[PDB]
Each structure stands twice: as structure tokens, then as C-alpha cells.
Design a protein around this nucleic acid. Structure first.
Length: 388
DNA sequence: TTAATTTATAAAATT
DNA sequence: AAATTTTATAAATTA
């Protein structure tokens, strides 16, 4: 702006210049989009700019400081500008983070919690595979979305929204409500995938296993107002905090990894987070740029694979159906693998899975070659009847 | 050492 | 009809 130039006299020459140039860059880029003052600065455009440029992406900070300046150095609300600052700093934490460290805690756990026979475990809970899976989903979930526990219990799965876009090749489970997040299937590593986890767990929870464990029935998805992502004693409520708090060290112990409760029960700040915002498109999903989602779920975005087998119901309320079809595709896609690793798993005990066909497809082509998951398997402390 | 936050123990209430 | 989440309560670890 004409009246903008004078406000950089007021700055040290060098950091007035650096800004001048950042600006030229940003608006000379902005000539690249359809579209006269403050509107030019919106989180959307600044974030797009920063992430879309490697040169900038590697060293975002001077840029961010420039932007917070130009912003507050224009007429923009104080609380507002500071929320912008919040988003930017979040973005940098996101870009700079190396998951390569934390990852093996995920791996090391997920596997062991899938393993149907845990001998070294004399601890009371975790008798079934549904207990193991319940915990594992809570863990994989925090790990991927980095969310508060309390908030974890706030989310009603009727709130959840399936994302299926085959135009851009995306699929996942989104929540645009109070906690803001997006989950995506890892087809490269089903075990460390929270959605596959949720699929098995949900089959066990709902269908149940005939003659062993009562399913809850698929009927209650109507009569109930709040369907919790994982159920405690009561159908309609998330398990209590101290309960999980017991379940956790129990597993970390057996896995021999150090345990800090604050990490899993509260937001972890050294860790990346989704922004907050008060149905998708090419570059974003719910409110969120895709690089957030691919980074935090640590998997490339892929279209939902079409399966011809239905383990989940094809008759439901329209709201939940899409969700359950996603679950169906992940489950059915990755099940032959689970069968080749842990054929002793509770899921396989259902007479349904015993049919001549379901046996047919469990024993058919493998979703990926065995030699892929070796390293993963090397991470469990009870070797099964099948050693490879 | 306190505060407060993590765990370990004792009736109890569902499932 | 048994057992383990839940209440509840007290002990104890961390800063």
C-alpha cells in the first residue's frame, strides 16, 4: 500500500529489507491465484505459499515473522494476529518434525497388541483380543491425531464423516467438530494402521463372535444418542480415565518401553497438531491442507480400494453406512495378511469367516509379500507357532 | 516441602 | 454367578 512504505522506515534497515523482499516474493506469487488489503493475508494463502516452496519450507521462520509483522503492522485484531502466529508456529513444528524417532514405539507396540497369544502377560486385563484392540486403537489414535484424552471421549462416532473422493484419490475418517482431525488408512503397514485396527475391533464389537462373544448388535446405532469410539462397561460411554491409565503401563512394561502418562492423556507439544477451525477438494480435506494429513498419518493419500466381499452390513442408516464401507474395504483388504501372521486371532473363530469362500479369499493372493513385514515381526517378545 | 499429578488399594455395581 | 470397570480413597512420586 502507498501508506505502507513509511512504516518500514521505522525498522532496522536490514530487517526492513528482508521484509521488502519476502513481500515481493509473496505478492508476485499471489499474482498466480484468482484473488483489496487485509484479505491478502489469510492463513490459507500464507500456509499454501510456505509449504509449496521448498526454498521457504526449509526455512519458514523469517517469513512467518515478516507476515505477523505486516499483519499487525496493518489493521488486524490483536487476538486475531496472535491466532495467526499460533497457526504458523504449528506449521513449522509440523514441517521440521522427524517422526523417524518416535515411530518404533508405535511399531514395537502395535504388533505385540495384535499378537493373539501373549504368554509373558500374566496381567488381569487383556484376556481377549478385543481388550488388546481397544487399547491399541486408543493408542494408534492418539499417536496419529495427537489429541487430548478428555476430547477423545467427547467424540460421538455419529459425528464422524467418511471421506471418499476418487476424483483426487482420497479416503479417510474426518471430524470437523470440537476436536479437529483426519484419519487415513495405511495400506503399507496395516498393523500400525488405526483404521484397520478399528475395523477388526468393530467387527468384534458389533458382529461379535458366534458362540464366544456377544456382538452388541448393529441395531443400537439408532436407539443410542452417543456412540463412543471405544466402549467401557456401559454401551454408551468411553472407558474411564484411570482404567486406561492402568491398561497403558501394563503394555509398555511388557514391551519394555518407558511410559509417561502425560504423553498419551494430554496433548504432547513437542509433537505436531491439527489447527482449529470455527467433504473435500484437491488440496484440502475437511478444513485441512493435505500435507498435514499425510504427515501426521505418515502415509501417502490413496483412493479407497473396491472389495467384493462384505463382512460389515450393507443395510444401514445412510449416515454411518459410508463409514462402515470404508471399514469394510480396509478390513477385507488387509485380512488375508493378518490371517497369514496370526491365524489364531479371535476374528477367525467366527463361523462366518469359516465359509468355503471366506476361507477361499483368506488363502488367495496376499495383499503384499510376506518379506515386507519381517522387521515389524522382529519386534514382539512372544514368538508364535509360526516363526519367520 | 508443598502442591499437584501418577499409582496403588478396597468396597461396589454392571456386564 | 463370576469378575472387572467403576467409584472411592489413600499412598507416593515428581518439579
Amino acid at each position: 500500500m502507498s501508506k505502507l512504505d513509511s512504516l518500514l522506515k521505522e525498522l532496522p534497515t536490514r530487517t526492513a529489507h528482508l521484509y521488502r523482499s519476502i513481500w515481493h516474493k509473496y505478492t508476485e506469487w499471489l499474482k498466480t491465484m484468482p484473488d483489496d488489503l487485509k484479505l491478502f493475508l489469510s492463513q490459507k494463502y500464507i500456509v499454501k505459499y510456505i509449504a509449496s516452496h521448498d526454498d521457504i519450507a526449509k526455512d519458514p521462520l523469517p517469513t512467518c515473522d515478516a507476515m505477523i509483522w505486516f499483519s499487525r503492522a496493518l489493521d488486524i485484531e490483536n487476538n486475531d494476529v496472535l491466532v495467526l502466529q499460533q497457526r504458523l508456529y504449528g506449521l513449522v513444528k509440523l514441517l521440521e518434525f522427524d517422526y523417524s524417532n518416535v515411530i518404533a514405539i508405535l511399531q514395537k507396540i502395535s504388533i505385540n497388541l495384535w499378537n493373539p497369544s501373549t504368554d509373558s502377560l500374566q496381567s488381569k486385563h487383556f484376556k481377549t483380543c478385543q481388550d488388546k484392540l481397544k487399547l491399541l486403537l486408543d493408542f494408534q489414535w492418539k499417536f496419529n491425531t495427537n489429541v487430548s484424552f478428555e476430547d477423545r471421549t467427547t467424540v460421538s462416532l455419529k459425528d464422524l464423516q467418511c471421506i471418499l473422493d476418487d476424483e483426487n484419490g482420497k479416503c479417510g475418517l474426518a471430524h470437523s467438530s470440537k476436536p479437529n482431525f483426519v484419519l487415513v488408512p495405511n495400506f503399507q503397514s496395516p498393523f500400525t494402521c488405526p483404521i484397520f485396527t478399528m475395523a477388526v475391533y468393530y467387527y468384534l464389537r458389533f458382529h461379535g463372535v458366534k458362540k464366544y462373544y456377544k456382538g452388541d448388535g448393529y441395531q443400537i446405532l439408532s436407539q443410542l444418542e452417543h456412540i463412543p469410539i471405544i466402549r467401557g462397561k456401559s454401551l454408551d460411554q468411553y472407558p474411564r480415565e484411570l482404567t486406561l491409565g492402568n491398561w497403558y503401563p501394563t503394555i509398555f512394561k511388557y514391551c519394555q518401553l518407558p511410559y509417561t502418562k502425560k504423553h498419551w492423556f494430554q496433548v504432547n507439544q513437542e509433537w505436531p497438531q491439527f489447527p482449529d477451525f470455527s467433504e473435500s477438494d484437491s488440496e484440502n480435506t475437511i478444513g485441512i491442507p493435505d500435507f498435514y494429513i499425510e504427515k501426521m498419518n505418515r502415509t501417502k493419500l490413496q483412493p479407497c480400494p473396491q472389495v467384493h466381499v462384505h463382512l460389515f452390513p450393507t443395510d444401514l442408516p445412510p449416515d454411518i453406512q459410508a463409514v462402515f464401507d470404508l471399514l469394510n474395504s480396509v478390513l477385507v483388504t488387509s485380512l488375508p495378511l493378518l490371517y497369514r501372521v496370526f491365524p489364531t486371532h479371535d476374528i477367525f473363530l467366527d463361523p462366518s469367516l469359516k465359509t468355503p469362500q471366506n476361507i477361499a479369499f483368506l488363502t488367495g493372493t496376499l495383499p503384499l509379500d510376506i518379506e515386507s513385514q519381517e522387521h515389524l515381526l522382529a519386534q514382539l517378545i512372544d514368538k508364535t507357532g509360526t516363526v519367520s
